[PDB]
Amino acid sequence: LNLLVIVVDANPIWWGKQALKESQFTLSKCIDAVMVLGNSHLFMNRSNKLAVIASHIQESRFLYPGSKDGKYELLTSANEVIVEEIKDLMTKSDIKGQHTETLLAGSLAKALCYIHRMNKEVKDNQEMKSRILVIKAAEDSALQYMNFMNVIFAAQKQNILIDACVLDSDSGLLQQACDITGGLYLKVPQMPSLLQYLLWVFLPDQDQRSQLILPPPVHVDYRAACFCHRNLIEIGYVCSVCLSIFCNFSPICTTCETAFKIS
Amino acid sequence: XXXXXXXXXXXXXXXXXXXXXXXXXXXXXXXXXXXGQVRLGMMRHLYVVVDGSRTMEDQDLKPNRLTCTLKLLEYFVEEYFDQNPISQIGIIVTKSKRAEKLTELSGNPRKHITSLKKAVDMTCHGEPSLYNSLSIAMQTLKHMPGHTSREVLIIFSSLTTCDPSNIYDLIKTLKAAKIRVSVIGLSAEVRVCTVLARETGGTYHVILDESHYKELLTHHVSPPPASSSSECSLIRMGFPQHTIXXXXXXXXXXXXXXXXXXXXXGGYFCPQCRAKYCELPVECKICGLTLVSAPHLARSYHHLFPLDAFQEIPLEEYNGERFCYGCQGELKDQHVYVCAVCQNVFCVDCDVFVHDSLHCCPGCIH
Amino acid sequence: RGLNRVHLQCRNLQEFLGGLSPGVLDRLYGHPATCLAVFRELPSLAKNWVMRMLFLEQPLPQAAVALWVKKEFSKAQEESTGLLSGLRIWHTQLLPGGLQGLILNPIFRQNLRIALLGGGKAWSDDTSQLGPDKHARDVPSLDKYAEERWEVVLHFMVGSPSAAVSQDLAQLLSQAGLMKSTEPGEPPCITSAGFQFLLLDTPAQLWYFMLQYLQTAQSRGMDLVEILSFLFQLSFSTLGKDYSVEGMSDSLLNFLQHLREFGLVFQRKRKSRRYYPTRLAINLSSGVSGAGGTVHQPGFIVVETNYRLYAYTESELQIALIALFSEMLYRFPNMVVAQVTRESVQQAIASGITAQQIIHFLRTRAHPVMLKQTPVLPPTITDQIRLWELERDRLRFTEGVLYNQFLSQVDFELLLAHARELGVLVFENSAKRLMVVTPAGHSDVKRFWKRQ
Ligand SMILES: [Zn+2]
Ligand SMILES: [Zn+2]
Ligand SMILES: [Zn+2]
Ligand SMILES: [Zn+2]
């Protein structure tokens, strides 16, 4: 019994720029590699479970949740509902300007509580191990860092591994998450081979991470800046009321308006 | 001697079910959690004083009080280092009218839980000594810096508080030394511990059950709010990056450690003294700087922009959103929980999960 | 019984499919049901390797396959490679130097890719158009039908007055080695293989039916390939959606009505165009139903340390099984109270049951209050059961041939070395020259004695 929770960063702006790029690799092969990974995960064992979430710019709508063309039947029904759900999601869509960068904290929150309720569903004989794949293709907004760390620590407590395939750009918070929870991070060097990366690195479960020789862990930067000038710090001043990082010593603490006792 | 008459019956087919359901519902209860937008003491040298009295061997709990108390302190050290990373713990067993600093003030759960697994095997002979235990805790907690909310937690059982000197001058000193002492009591209320708790600044509590005692230690896990007395300083902090053996040890710096160690190739340095530490966060052993990886500041950011209350409504009540906004499931029970700002829908499982672990509303992020 | 006793060995689909003809195998993977069904049987290493190498047209060298695995796991690695190789998945090719390339069998690979992706066949699903069917059957009534028919077969083996078997199935039970007919004026008995068949899991019992049913598939004009493709087509189906029959041969019709007699498939009429694959047919899988609980039925036997069985189930079948390996005292309309006596188990092994059947039987039907124990049975009782079967099974028999009282000692180790050479050594001596060779392979060494 295992539970893969794929999260696909469906930024319509990014994949729109990718489809106006007229490349080989568009959103169709992304969601198709997602579904082939999902059918492969349901295919490896009968007891496996699948859930696929799509972070849109303004909503975390889930994608998931006879045989006409020769598949296994539940794979056919799952593929039909994922296809119809992305067609209901992406085509019927909206336009706003203040909030156009994608989100990842909310979809991870839904994944965490979904794994919680599906672990309450589990009976006493069997036990559920779980992980969250994150297929990221956009640029994450900085503005939700306060939120984002929280879901990582939830996955630290709930023992949910986190994996990430980033497509275009590196992401410090997401390699940070895959460092904290014990998951895995991978930056793909060539787009259209995506599925073959997933079926060897991110398909294998927790009792095959230890068996397979995998690409090695990149060193993780624990950079830290002030809340003052945003510049890199090796020695900082941190308040004990506000609990905020200041770079240079200042009399009056700005973050919490503290009547600072001076010695 | 006639408890057998507690089982009534009206139709007797579901009436025994009603009596069993009333009993099984009366055998459970819910917690009481408090919210505050107030200053908290987040660097927190807490210092645990356990009894080793004669009354620790009494069997009011299901094992004797020593064993249950020590088990819940193992859970306490676990959850306190799980929630506050900067802080430290020190453990004194108070035994035979004398006080014994069993484990010094440090910040990693391995040594403390190892010492508690050792301290299962003790004897618990004699009467306690609140004077000497508060003296050792004061002696170590004089010279921690002033922004630390210096806290002592006395898990105290017996009633004869056998001091060797006057313990109102200690309470006047500890009042002036801005320490904070909280006593969790067994079997009784004692006036001296009440004066100590209400004067030093702490809180006194007496124990019913296993569950109530877990609720009290869970109440003392969280950072308690500050008085109008504690210093609000600005501690100088250090953020050492991790350093592996540089480029296949091309001109590396092979060290042993800094506190049965092997040959360390790389790891964490210090930005003040340039020493070699394996684990982070560790207070600098030769400088006085405090070293922080900085998710260890992010592990305790939820205290500062905290949660709110869920509007709890049991009935059906206008619910045009049948599914859980948490995890997309139906609401098959009569408890629906609605947030304050976004006012989405959550069930009981999402309630316990959000309010205990995830610490944020999933709606308000969107 | 001058040989050893009839130990009921489940093949677990490896010794079945490993040990056939490779032309039979290359025809067998010609339906995606069989490719998924052989896929899920594989160990997890071979599983991930097939799903790795699936989307690939190049024979990868041996170095990469040996070089995909961490160093500590080579002992548990060569089993997956050898199991892929012997089962005609990995046929070996050559890179044009000396690197022995490895490539999946393109029939197997193409039909797995049909099982995962779009395909050119249609899984033999059809419907002209028939909507809500005349006497549509309900899903718990399909469960009831499965219970009724397969318990009628089990009562027939037990020997109840509910003997509704239609005598082709009785001939099948006599042909598979389960119910031996003796002195042909119709006593059908039970062989010891029948007793070991009774105490087995329900998917293990049905899969043992299919293995010993296809063991004698050279009888009625049957072919292994189409029948196994239909079995693996049944067990990858859904209870809800309904099927049709058009697209099946007439020998398939005879097998499907014989299968209706099994109870794995609910028909409506014999001349109809519809079948309902029953809940027994889906859980047809070469495996284990559990050690604390069964998807079929929740467990019901509370085994206390008093050697005391509390069965919460009213059924004459399972009461007869608990009568087999125990002795029974109270019977209430909800419950049966039995005691596992030493003499009851020594009766249950006199008829011939190795007591791993018993312990796995009790672990299968473990009541959900007996759960939340990490040793779900009390280990005093379980180790006592094993000690009772080790008291009963203390003789081990072997047909041999004697070499005694040789005239020398050089010919002693010469005969011993020639025995070791042809793999016919059984037992040796050091002092008094008393050797045991295989008696069927003795004539080789005997004609060697007439040659020196
Ligand atoms: Zn501040
Ligand atoms: Zn230093
Ligand atoms: Zn909200
Ligand atoms: Zn929910």
Side-chain angles (χ1 to χ4, degrees), chain A, chain B, chain C residues 1-404 410-452:
Chain A
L1 180 59
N2 295 314
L3 181 58
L4 176 64
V5 182
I6 305 169
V7 174
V8 47
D9 192 1
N11 198 170
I13 295 95
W14 189 81
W15 297 100
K17 294 178 183 179
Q18 184 65 40
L20 291 175
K21 190 178 177 182
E22 294 293 327
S23 176
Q24 185 62 255
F25 181 75
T26 64
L27 184 63
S28 289
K29 286 191 289 296
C30 182
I31 309 298
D32 285 332
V34 168
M35 288 190 289
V36 176
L37 181 60
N39 296 126
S40 302
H41 175 66
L42 293 174
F43 206 77
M44 286 181 68
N45 197 359
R46 184 176 183 270
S47 295
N48 286 323
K49 296 181 183 180
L50 173 61
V52 171
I53 309 170
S55 175
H56 198 264
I57 47 93
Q58 67 187 0
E59 55 181 356
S60 294
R61 187 175 294 171
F62 286 5
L63 304 179
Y64 181 78
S67 65
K68 293 181 181 179
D69 294 331
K71 296 179 183 177
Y72 177 77
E73 294 175 353
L74 293 175
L75 304 181
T76 308
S77 67
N79 284 316
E80 285 181 353
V81 65
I82 292 171
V83 168
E84 187 65 30
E85 193 67 29
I86 67 166
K87 288 183 182 180
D88 198 359
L89 185 67
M90 297 304 294
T91 60
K92 176 70 175 177
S93 293
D94 298 328
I95 177 168
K96 287 184 179 182
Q98 291 181 357
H99 185 73
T100 189
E101 290 293 328
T102 187
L103 61 96
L104 193 62
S107 295
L108 287 168
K110 284 188 175 183
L112 287 161
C113 59
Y114 183 81
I115 294 164
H116 179 68
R117 70 98 58 83
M118 290 295 170
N119 200 2
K120 284 186 175 180
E121 193 75 25
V122 172
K123 295 178 181 179
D124 294 332
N125 192 2
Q126 59 184 359
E127 290 179 353
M128 213 206 238
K129 290 181 179 180
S130 61
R131 61 179 180 174
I132 299 172
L133 188 69
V134 175
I135 297 169
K136 186 174 184 289
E139 299 180 355
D140 49 353
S141 177
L143 189 66
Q144 290 90 16
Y145 172 76
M146 165 59 75
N147 301 115
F148 190 77
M149 276 293 176
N150 284 316
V151 306
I152 303 166
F153 295 116
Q156 180 60 258
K157 290 181 183 179
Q158 205 63 251
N159 204 354
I160 299 169
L161 299 185
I162 293 179
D163 304 330
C165 181
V166 295
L167 292 175
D168 195 3
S169 180
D170 290 327
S171 56
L173 274 74
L174 191 59
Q175 66 185 356
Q176 180 65 257
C178 298
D179 183 73
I180 291 172
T181 60
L184 201 147
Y185 178 71
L186 184 59
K187 192 262 191 297
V188 62
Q190 187 180 3
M191 301 297 174
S193 174
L194 173 64
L195 182 68
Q196 195 67 36
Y197 289 99
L198 302 182
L199 296 180
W200 179 244
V201 180
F202 287 151
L203 183 64
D205 295 327
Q206 296 188 358
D207 294 332
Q208 295 184 0
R209 306 287 188 181
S210 68
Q211 294 179 352
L212 297 176
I213 290 173
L214 288 176
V218 187
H219 178 69
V220 180
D221 51 351
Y222 287 159
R223 307 287 183 181
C226 75
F227 295 156
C228 64
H229 303 90
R230 306 287 296 171
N231 53 5
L232 187 63
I233 285 177
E234 198 71 23
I235 290 172
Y237 294 101
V238 176
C239 182
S240 65
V241 171
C242 65
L243 196 62
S244 68
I245 300 168
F246 286 167
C247 184
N248 194 1
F249 182 75
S250 63
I252 298 169
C253 181
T254 308
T255 310
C256 52
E257 288 180 350
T258 296
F260 176 76
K261 291 183 181 180
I262 302 167
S263 66
Chain B
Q37 201 64 43
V38 297
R39 294 183 184 179
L40 303 176
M42 302 185 78
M43 291 181 69
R44 185 185 171 186
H45 284 288
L46 183 64
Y47 210 87
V48 173
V49 174
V50 189
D51 279 339
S53 307
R54 296 178 301 166
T55 320
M56 278 281 105
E57 293 292 329
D58 196 359
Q59 292 180 356
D60 283 334
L61 280 310
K62 290 182 180 180
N64 54 3
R65 294 180 184 176
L66 180 68
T67 302
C68 172
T69 288
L70 213 63
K71 184 174 183 179
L72 284 181
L73 279 175
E74 178 173 356
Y75 171 70
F76 179 71
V77 172
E78 278 287 332
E79 191 177 1
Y80 180 66
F81 282 150
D82 200 4
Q83 191 171 3
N84 198 355
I86 305 169
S87 67
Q88 290 188 357
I89 301 171
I91 290 172
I92 293 175
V93 172
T94 299
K95 181 179 180 179
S96 296
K97 294 170 282 293
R98 292 173 179 177
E100 299 171 356
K101 184 169 174 173
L102 183 64
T103 303
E104 293 181 352
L105 188 62
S106 71
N108 286 318
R110 294 187 184 181
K111 183 172 71 175
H112 302 291
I113 296 168
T114 302
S115 63
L116 294 181
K117 294 296 184 185
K118 178 65 179 177
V120 175
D121 294 332
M122 66 176 291
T123 305
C124 286
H125 178 72
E127 298 182 358
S129 175
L130 197 64
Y131 180 81
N132 306 119
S133 297
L134 289 171
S135 292
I136 293 177
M138 179 183 71
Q139 184 178 4
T140 304
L141 286 167
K142 282 180 181 179
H143 303 287
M144 305 299 107
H147 59 278
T148 295
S149 65
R150 298 187 295 277
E151 299 173 0
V152 180
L153 181 66
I154 301 170
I155 294 170
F156 188 68
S157 68
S158 75
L159 306 177
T160 301
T161 311
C162 187
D163 53 357
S165 180
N166 192 359
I167 56 176
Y168 283 173
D169 291 332
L170 278 191
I171 297 176
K172 189 173 183 179
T173 297
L174 294 177
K175 180 68 173 177
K178 64 187 179 181
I179 202 168
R180 177 254 181 83
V181 177
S182 301
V183 178
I184 293 174
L186 278 162
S187 299
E189 179 178 3
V190 177
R191 176 62 179 174
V192 173
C193 297
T194 301
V195 172
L196 178 61
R198 75 179 186 179
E199 185 170 0
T200 310
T203 311
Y204 185 73
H205 291 291
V206 190
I207 294 161
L208 295 176
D209 300 327
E210 295 287 332
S211 66
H212 187 75
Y213 179 38
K214 289 184 180 178
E215 288 183 353
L216 295 175
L217 285 173
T218 304
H219 179 72
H220 289 284
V221 170
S222 176
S227 300
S228 66
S229 67
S230 183
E231 285 185 353
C232 305
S233 84
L234 183 64
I235 184 165
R236 188 175 174 181
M237 201 76 78
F239 295 155
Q241 292 179 356
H242 192 276
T243 300
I244 58 171
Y268 289 104
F269 280 158
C270 181
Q272 190 74 40
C273 68
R274 302 289 298 165
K276 175 69 72 173
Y277 288 155
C278 178
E279 185 181 359
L280 195 61
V282 171
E283 178 71 27
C284 182
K285 301 289 184 180
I286 58 172
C287 284
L289 189 64
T290 303
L291 297 180
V292 164
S293 177
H296 296 290
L297 301 177
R299 193 176 291 271
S300 67
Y301 275 162
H302 59 277
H303 298 293
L304 302 172
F305 186 74
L307 282 173
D308 292 327
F310 275 174
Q311 297 182 357
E312 301 189 356
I313 44 171
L315 278 301
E316 288 184 353
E317 287 177 356
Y318 66 82
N319 283 318
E321 295 181 355
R322 296 177 178 177
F323 296 155
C324 182
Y325 181 74
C327 63
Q328 192 171 0
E330 282 188 352
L331 305 173
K332 293 181 182 180
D333 296 332
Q334 285 190 356
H335 290 290
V336 175
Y337 300 141
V338 172
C339 180
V341 177
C342 63
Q343 294 188 355
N344 292 318
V345 178
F346 298 97
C347 66
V348 177
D349 295 333
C350 295
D351 173 72
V352 177
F353 186 76
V354 164
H355 291 173
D356 286 331
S357 294
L358 198 148
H359 294 172
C360 288
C361 177
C364 299
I365 301 169
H366 290 88
Chain C
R1 299 180 185 180
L3 296 169
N4 285 319
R5 64 264 183 99
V6 184
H7 183 70
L8 191 61
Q9 290 175 352
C10 299
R11 293 180 182 177
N12 200 359
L13 188 58
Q14 288 183 2
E15 282 186 352
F16 178 71
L17 289 179
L20 292 176
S21 296
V24 178
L25 298 175
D26 285 329
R27 286 182 60 196
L28 183 60
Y29 305 121
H31 289 282
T34 62
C35 286
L36 167 55
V38 178
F39 181 76
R40 288 183 183 175
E41 200 274 326
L42 295 172
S44 65
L45 289 166
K47 194 84 70 69
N48 201 0
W49 279 355
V50 170
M51 193 58 72
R52 172 61 159 168
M53 294 175 66
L54 183 64
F55 291 91
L56 190 65
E57 300 295 327
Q58 296 178 358
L60 296 178
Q62 185 68 39
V65 170
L67 199 63
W68 282 350
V69 181
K70 196 177 287 185
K71 297 179 182 179
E72 294 179 352
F73 293 148
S74 66
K75 294 180 182 179
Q77 192 61 56
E78 293 183 354
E79 295 178 355
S80 67
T81 296
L83 189 59
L84 289 172
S85 69
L87 197 59
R88 293 292 180 186
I89 292 169
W90 278 358
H91 66 280
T92 300
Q93 202 171 2
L94 289 175
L95 288 177
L99 290 171
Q100 295 180 356
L102 299 177
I103 183 171
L104 272 69
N105 192 359
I107 300 169
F108 174 73
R109 167 254 191 86
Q110 178 57 44
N111 286 314
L112 274 182
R113 190 177 295 171
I114 290 168
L116 288 171
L117 302 174
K121 289 185 178 181
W123 190 261
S124 298
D125 191 1
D126 195 359
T127 297
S128 66
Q129 183 60 40
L130 294 173
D133 292 321
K134 295 180 181 181
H135 185 74
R137 191 69 179 172
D138 300 330
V139 181
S141 70
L142 289 172
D143 295 331
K144 290 179 181 180
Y145 179 75
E147 292 173 355
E148 287 177 357
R149 302 294 290 166
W150 184 247
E151 282 188 357
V152 160
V153 181
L154 287 166
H155 286 298
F156 185 80
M157 280 176 278
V158 168
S160 73
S162 64
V165 167
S166 64
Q167 82 181 357
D168 289 332
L169 174 57
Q171 188 62 42
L172 180 65
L173 287 169
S174 65
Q175 188 175 1
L178 277 70
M179 292 176 70
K180 183 178 180 181
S181 66
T182 306
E183 294 179 355
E186 291 183 353
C189 293
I190 311 164
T191 318
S192 66
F195 282 153
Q196 293 174 357
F197 178 75
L198 282 171
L199 300 181
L200 201 62
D201 295 332
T202 303
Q205 284 182 356
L206 293 174
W207 182 250
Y208 185 81
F209 244 176
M210 297 306 109
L211 291 183
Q212 292 295 321
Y213 178 80
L214 297 177
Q215 191 71 40
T216 175
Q218 292 181 355
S219 70
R220 292 181 177 179
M222 293 297 108
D223 283 330
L224 296 175
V225 177
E226 180 62 33
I227 295 172
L228 280 173
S229 182
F230 189 75
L231 285 176
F232 293 154
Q233 187 173 1
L234 290 174
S235 65
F236 293 151
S237 66
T238 307
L239 295 173
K241 288 184 180 180
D242 296 330
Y243 290 98
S244 69
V245 186
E246 294 179 354
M248 293 175 73
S249 67
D250 291 330
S251 69
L252 281 172
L253 298 178
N254 286 322
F255 171 67
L256 185 58
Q257 298 171 3
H258 185 74
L259 190 67
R260 182 186 184 271
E261 297 179 357
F262 291 165
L264 306 186
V265 168
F266 178 75
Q267 283 280 324
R268 179 61 181 167
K269 291 181 182 180
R270 184 172 181 177
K271 295 292 183 181
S272 63
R273 292 292 183 182
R274 189 165 300 277
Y275 67 95
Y276 295 154
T278 324
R279 187 64 174 167
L280 290 175
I282 290 176
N283 286 322
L284 178 62
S285 68
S286 66
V288 177
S289 69
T294 309
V295 180
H296 299 286
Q297 295 175 358
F300 56 92
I301 293 172
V302 178
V303 184
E304 284 95 353
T305 316
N306 309 332
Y307 300 154
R308 182 62 64 89
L309 301 171
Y310 288 147
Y312 284 180
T313 295
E314 177 66 30
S315 295
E316 291 180 352
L317 169 67
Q318 290 169 350
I319 282 169
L321 301 177
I322 297 171
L324 292 173
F325 71 100
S326 68
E327 66 185 1
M328 307 173 89
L329 295 174
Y330 289 98
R331 287 179 73 188
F332 299 161
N334 201 6
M335 184 180 69
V336 187
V337 174
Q339 185 179 2
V340 182
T341 310
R342 176 183 174 181
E343 292 186 354
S344 70
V345 176
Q346 299 289 317
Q347 288 294 322
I349 305 172
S351 71
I353 293 163
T354 301
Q356 186 64 42
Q357 302 290 321
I358 292 171
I359 301 169
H360 179 72
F361 183 83
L362 294 169
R363 285 181 180 176
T364 300
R365 295 161 178 81
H367 183 72
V369 181
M370 181 56 68
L371 295 178
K372 289 184 179 181
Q373 299 175 357
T374 303
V376 291
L377 294 178
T380 297
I381 303 170
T382 297
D383 295 331
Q384 187 66 42
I385 290 297
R386 291 175 182 170
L387 186 58
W388 282 338
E389 68 162 354
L390 289 175
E391 283 191 355
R392 188 61 179 173
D393 289 330
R394 208 185 295 176
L395 286 171
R396 293 180 184 178
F397 291 158
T398 300
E399 293 176 351
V401 59
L402 176 57
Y403 280 159
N404 54 356
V410 179
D411 291 329
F412 174 71
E413 288 187 357
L414 181 59
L415 291 178
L416 189 63
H418 185 77
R420 182 174 174 175
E421 181 176 0
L422 292 175
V424 296
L425 196 155
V426 177
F427 178 74
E428 49 87 19
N429 194 359
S430 296
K432 293 189 285 184
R433 291 176 288 176
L434 304 177
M435 293 180 286
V436 174
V437 196
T438 65
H442 178 268
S443 65
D444 302 334
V445 188
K446 186 173 175 65
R447 292 174 182 173
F448 178 74
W449 174 64
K450 298 178 183 180
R451 290 189 295 271
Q452 290 180 353

